[PDB]
Tab-separated table of C-alpha atoms (C1' of nucleotides) in Angstrom:
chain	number	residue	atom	x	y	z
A	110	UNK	CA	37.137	-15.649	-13.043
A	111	UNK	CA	38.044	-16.158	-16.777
A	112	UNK	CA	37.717	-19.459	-18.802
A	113	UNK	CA	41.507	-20.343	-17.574
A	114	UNK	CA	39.907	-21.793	-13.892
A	115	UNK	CA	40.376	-25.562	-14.301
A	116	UNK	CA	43.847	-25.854	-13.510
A	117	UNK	CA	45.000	-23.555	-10.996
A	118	UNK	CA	41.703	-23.919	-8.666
A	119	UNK	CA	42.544	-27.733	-8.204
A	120	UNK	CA	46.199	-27.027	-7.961
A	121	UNK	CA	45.055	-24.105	-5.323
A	122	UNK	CA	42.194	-26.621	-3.560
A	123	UNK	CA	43.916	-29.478	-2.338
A	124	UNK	CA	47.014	-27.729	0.030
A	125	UNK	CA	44.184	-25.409	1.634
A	126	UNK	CA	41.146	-27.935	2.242
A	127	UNK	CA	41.796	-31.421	2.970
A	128	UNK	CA	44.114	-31.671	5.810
A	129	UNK	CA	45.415	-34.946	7.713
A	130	UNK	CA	45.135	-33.679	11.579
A	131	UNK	CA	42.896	-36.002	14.026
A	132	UNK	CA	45.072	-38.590	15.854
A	133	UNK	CA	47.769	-36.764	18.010
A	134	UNK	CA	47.549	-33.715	20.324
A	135	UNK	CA	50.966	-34.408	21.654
A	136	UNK	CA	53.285	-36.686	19.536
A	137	UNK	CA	54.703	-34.736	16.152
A	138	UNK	CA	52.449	-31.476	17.061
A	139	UNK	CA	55.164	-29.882	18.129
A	140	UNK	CA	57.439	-29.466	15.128
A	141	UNK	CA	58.405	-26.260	14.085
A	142	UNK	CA	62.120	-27.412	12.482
A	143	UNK	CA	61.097	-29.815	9.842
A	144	UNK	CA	61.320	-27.516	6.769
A	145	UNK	CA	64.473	-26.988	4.428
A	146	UNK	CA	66.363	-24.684	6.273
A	147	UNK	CA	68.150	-22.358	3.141
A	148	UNK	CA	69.873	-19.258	2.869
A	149	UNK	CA	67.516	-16.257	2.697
A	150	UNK	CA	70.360	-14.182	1.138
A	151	UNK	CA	70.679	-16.370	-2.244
A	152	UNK	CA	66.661	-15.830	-3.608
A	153	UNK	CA	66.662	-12.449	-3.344
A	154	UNK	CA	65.592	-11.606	-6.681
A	155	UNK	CA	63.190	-13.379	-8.585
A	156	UNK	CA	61.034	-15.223	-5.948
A	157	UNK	CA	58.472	-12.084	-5.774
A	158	UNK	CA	55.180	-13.714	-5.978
A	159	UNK	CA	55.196	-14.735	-1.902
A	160	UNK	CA	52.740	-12.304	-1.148
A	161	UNK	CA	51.125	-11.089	-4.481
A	162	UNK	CA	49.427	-15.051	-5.041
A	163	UNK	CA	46.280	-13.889	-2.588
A	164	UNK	CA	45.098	-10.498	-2.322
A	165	UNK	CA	42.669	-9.620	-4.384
A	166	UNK	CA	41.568	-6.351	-4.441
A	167	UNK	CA	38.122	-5.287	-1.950
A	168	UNK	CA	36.168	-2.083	-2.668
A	169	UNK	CA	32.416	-3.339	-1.790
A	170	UNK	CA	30.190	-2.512	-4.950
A	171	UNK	CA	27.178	-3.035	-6.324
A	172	UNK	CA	25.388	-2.105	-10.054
A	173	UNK	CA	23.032	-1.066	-11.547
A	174	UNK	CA	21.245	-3.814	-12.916
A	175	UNK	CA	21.903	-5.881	-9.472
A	176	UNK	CA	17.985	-6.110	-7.645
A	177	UNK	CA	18.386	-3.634	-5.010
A	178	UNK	CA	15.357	-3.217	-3.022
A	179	UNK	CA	14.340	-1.259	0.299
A	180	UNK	CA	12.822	-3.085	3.375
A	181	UNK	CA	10.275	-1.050	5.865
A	182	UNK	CA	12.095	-0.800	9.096
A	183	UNK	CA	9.814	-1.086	12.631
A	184	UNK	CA	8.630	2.424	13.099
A	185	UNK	CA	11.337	3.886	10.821
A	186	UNK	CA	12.968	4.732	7.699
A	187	UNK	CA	13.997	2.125	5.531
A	188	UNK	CA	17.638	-0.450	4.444
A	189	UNK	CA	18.587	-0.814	1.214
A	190	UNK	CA	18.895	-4.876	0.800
A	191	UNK	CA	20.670	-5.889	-2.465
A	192	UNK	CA	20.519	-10.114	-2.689
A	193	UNK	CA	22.747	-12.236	-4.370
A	194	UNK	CA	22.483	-15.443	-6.016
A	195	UNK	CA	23.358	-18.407	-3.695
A	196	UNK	CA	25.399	-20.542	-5.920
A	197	UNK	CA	26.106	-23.177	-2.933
A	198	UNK	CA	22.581	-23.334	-1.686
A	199	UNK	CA	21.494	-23.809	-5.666
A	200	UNK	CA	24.833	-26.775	-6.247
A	201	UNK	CA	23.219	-28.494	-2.571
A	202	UNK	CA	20.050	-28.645	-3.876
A	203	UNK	CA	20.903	-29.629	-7.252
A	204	UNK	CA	21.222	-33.417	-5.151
A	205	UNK	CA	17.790	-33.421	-6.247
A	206	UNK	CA	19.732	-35.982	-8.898
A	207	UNK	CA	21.398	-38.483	-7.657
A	208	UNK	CA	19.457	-39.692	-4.635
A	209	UNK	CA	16.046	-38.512	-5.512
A	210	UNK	CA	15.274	-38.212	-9.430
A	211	UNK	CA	16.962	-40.801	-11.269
A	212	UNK	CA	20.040	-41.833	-9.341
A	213	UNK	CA	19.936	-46.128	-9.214
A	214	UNK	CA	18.496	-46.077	-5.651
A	215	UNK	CA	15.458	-44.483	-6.511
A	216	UNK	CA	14.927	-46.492	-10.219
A	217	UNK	CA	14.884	-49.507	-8.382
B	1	C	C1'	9.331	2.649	-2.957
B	2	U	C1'	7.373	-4.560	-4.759
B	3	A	C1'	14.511	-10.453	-7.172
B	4	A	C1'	12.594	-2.765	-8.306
B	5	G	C1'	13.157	-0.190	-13.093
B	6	A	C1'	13.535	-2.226	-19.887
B	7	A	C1'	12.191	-5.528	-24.164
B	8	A	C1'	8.841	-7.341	-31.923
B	9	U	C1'	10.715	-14.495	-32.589
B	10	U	C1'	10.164	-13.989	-38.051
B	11	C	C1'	9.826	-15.350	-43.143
B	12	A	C1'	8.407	-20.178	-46.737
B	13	C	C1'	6.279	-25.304	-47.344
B	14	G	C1'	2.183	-31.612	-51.292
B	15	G	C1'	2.453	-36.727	-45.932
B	16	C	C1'	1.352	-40.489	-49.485
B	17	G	C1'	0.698	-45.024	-52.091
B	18	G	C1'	-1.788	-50.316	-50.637
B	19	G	C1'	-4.692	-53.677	-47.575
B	20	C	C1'	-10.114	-60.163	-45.937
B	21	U	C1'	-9.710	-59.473	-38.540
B	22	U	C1'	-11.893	-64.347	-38.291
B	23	G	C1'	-14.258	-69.052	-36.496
B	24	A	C1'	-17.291	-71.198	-31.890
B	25	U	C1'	-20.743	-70.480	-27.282
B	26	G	C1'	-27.294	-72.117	-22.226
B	27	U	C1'	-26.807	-66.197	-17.683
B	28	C	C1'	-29.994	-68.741	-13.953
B	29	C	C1'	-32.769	-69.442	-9.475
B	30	G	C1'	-35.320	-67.262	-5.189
B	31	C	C1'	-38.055	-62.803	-3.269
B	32	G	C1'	-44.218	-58.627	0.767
B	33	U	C1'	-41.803	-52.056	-0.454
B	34	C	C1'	-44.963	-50.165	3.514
B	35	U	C1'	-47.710	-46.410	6.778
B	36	A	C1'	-49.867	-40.950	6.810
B	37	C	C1'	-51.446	-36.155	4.512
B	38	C	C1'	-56.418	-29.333	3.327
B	39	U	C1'	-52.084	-26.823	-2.327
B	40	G	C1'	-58.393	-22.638	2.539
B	41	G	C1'	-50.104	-19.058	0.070
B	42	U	C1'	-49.846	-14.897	-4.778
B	43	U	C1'	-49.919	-22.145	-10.109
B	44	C	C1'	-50.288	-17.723	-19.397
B	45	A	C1'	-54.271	-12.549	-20.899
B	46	C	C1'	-61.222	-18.961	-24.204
B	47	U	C1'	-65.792	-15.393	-30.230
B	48	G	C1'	-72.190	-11.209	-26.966
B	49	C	C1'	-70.146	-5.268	-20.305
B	50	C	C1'	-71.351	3.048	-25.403
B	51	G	C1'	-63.978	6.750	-26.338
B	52	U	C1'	-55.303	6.841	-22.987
B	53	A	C1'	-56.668	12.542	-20.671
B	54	U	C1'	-58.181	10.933	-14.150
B	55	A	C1'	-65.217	11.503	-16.750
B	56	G	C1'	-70.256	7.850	-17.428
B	57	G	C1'	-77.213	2.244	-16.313
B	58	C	C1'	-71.971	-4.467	-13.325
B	59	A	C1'	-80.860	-9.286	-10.781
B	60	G	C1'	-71.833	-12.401	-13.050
RNA sequence: CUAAGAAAUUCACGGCGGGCUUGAUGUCCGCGUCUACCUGGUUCACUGCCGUAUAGGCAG
């Protein structure tokens, strides 16, 4: 996003990810009538950001300085593959730290 | 049909003054190297044999 991503992404991380759920399949798994229980009539107005606070917008794109590239099909024509950069695969192996290059395990 | 396709790093400069590395020392002691072979393979142009053109007396 912009430079404004360091305190709404932990606000927005922790309800989502992170959830209590492994002891009872029976017992308090069956509550549906714990909430509030308000009016709907009396927030009519100004509580309009229920559904607006997820949907981004789609449109699959691409660009023109992006690394597309075409791959020989088996006794065919050809697909256009256009990689991206694995940011997860590249934060997993930057572990190379801590337990391998100077992390206190290894120093010792 | 290629992590495709593109690209000017550049200008200038005082490293420098001085200096005690010393003193001493047991390398010794022993020893069986042997047998055989063809350089009879192409391993520098040493003063006295009348003329490239197809031509002329080599008791080397």
């Amino acid at each position: 996003g912009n430079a404004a991503a360091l305190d709404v992404f932990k606000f927005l991380s922790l309800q989502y990810q992170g959830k209590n759920l492994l002891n009872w399949l029976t017992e308090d798994s069956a509550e549906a009538l714990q909430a509030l229980s308000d009016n709907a009539e009396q927030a009519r107005e100004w509580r309009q950001a229920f559904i607006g606070i997820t949907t981004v917008k789609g449109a699959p794109a691409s660009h023109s300085l992006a690394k597309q590239l075409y791959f020989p099909l088996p006794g065919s024509g050809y697909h256009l593959l256009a990689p991206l950069f694995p940011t997860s695969l590249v934060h997993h192996v930057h572990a190379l730290l801590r337990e391998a290059r100077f992390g206190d395990a290894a120093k010792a």
